[PDB]
């Protein structure tokens, strides 16, 4: 086992990893985008999944862990406070991945969809992902949907190797 990062452009509900990170909202609602796809595939994981901004809460669907990570909605937060909460959400993901003992995890880029406040946050969100996950030994598979984002994420992964 050599821990790795990979990126795939496809629906995270089809992931091939041992657990999934949901781009969750604080109230545990079905939501939109990635969150709604996670709700359709693992609805049982939404039982008592509500948790504050900047935190993560894991709920099992059977034995399959869904890590509900709540990034900030940048429409509501200032750039400085939102940046702090986004970094914090990813730190909580790293703790949960470690506690669960999984060999791999499927992760989306938090706060880059409807919580982005209308801005391109690929680099900001990806760099906070790396800051949290670099010290873990899980294989990390990042899921995206946009063709140009796939290329940019792949370039960012490859240039550190
Ligand atoms: Ca918070
Ligand atoms: Cl590996
Ligand atoms: Cl797909
Ligand atoms: Cl929401
Ligand atoms: Cl989002
Ligand atoms: Cl994307």
Q: What is the 3-state secondary structure (H, E, C) of the chain?
A: CCCCEEEEECCHHHCCCCCEEEECCCCCCCCCCHHHHHHHHCHHHHCCCCCCCCCEEEEEECCEEEEEECCCCCCCCCHHHHHHHHHHHHHHHHHHHHHHCCCEEEEECCCCCCCCCCCCCHHHHHHHHHHHHCCCCCEEEEEECCHHHHHHHHHHHHHHC
The residue count of the chain comes to 161
| Distance from the alpha carbon of residue 67 to the mean position of ligand 6, in angstroms | 19
Q: Could you give the CA distance from residue 62 to residue 59 in angstroms, rounded to a whole number?
A: 9
Q: How close is the Cα of 84 to the center of ligand 3, in Å?
A: 31
Q: How far is the CA of 109 from the centre of ligand 2 (A)?
A: 21
Which technique was the structure solved with, according to the deposited record? X-ray
Q: Where are the domains of the chain?
A: 5-154
Torsional sign, CA 68, 96, 88, 141: negative
Side-chain half-sphere exposure of 80, counting CA atoms within 13 A: 0
The residues placing their C-beta within 5 Å of ligand 6, an ion, are 144-146, 149
CATH fold, domain 5-154, is 3.40.220
């Amino acid at each position: 086992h050599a821990p790795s990062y990979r990126v795939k452009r496809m629906d995270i509900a089809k992931n091939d990893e041992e657990c999934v990170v949901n781009a969750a909202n604080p109230r545990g609602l079905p939501g939109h985008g990635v969150c709604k796809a996670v709700y359709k595939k693992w609805p049982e994981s939404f039982k008592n999944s509500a948790t504050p901004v900047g935190t993560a809460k894991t709920v099992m669907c059977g034995t399959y862990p869904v890590i509900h990570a709540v990034g900030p909605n940048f429409s509501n937060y200032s750039e400085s406070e939102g940046d702090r909460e986004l970094a914090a959400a990813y730190r909580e993901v790293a703790k949960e991945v470690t506690r669960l003992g999984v060999n791999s995890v499927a992760i989306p880029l938090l706060s880059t969809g409807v919580y982005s406040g209308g801005k391109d946050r690929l680099t900001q969100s990806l760099n906070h992902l790396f800051t949290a996950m670099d010290s873990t030994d899980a294989d990390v598979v990042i899921y995206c949907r946009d063709k140009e984002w796939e290329k940019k994420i792949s370039e960012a992964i490859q240039m550190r190797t």
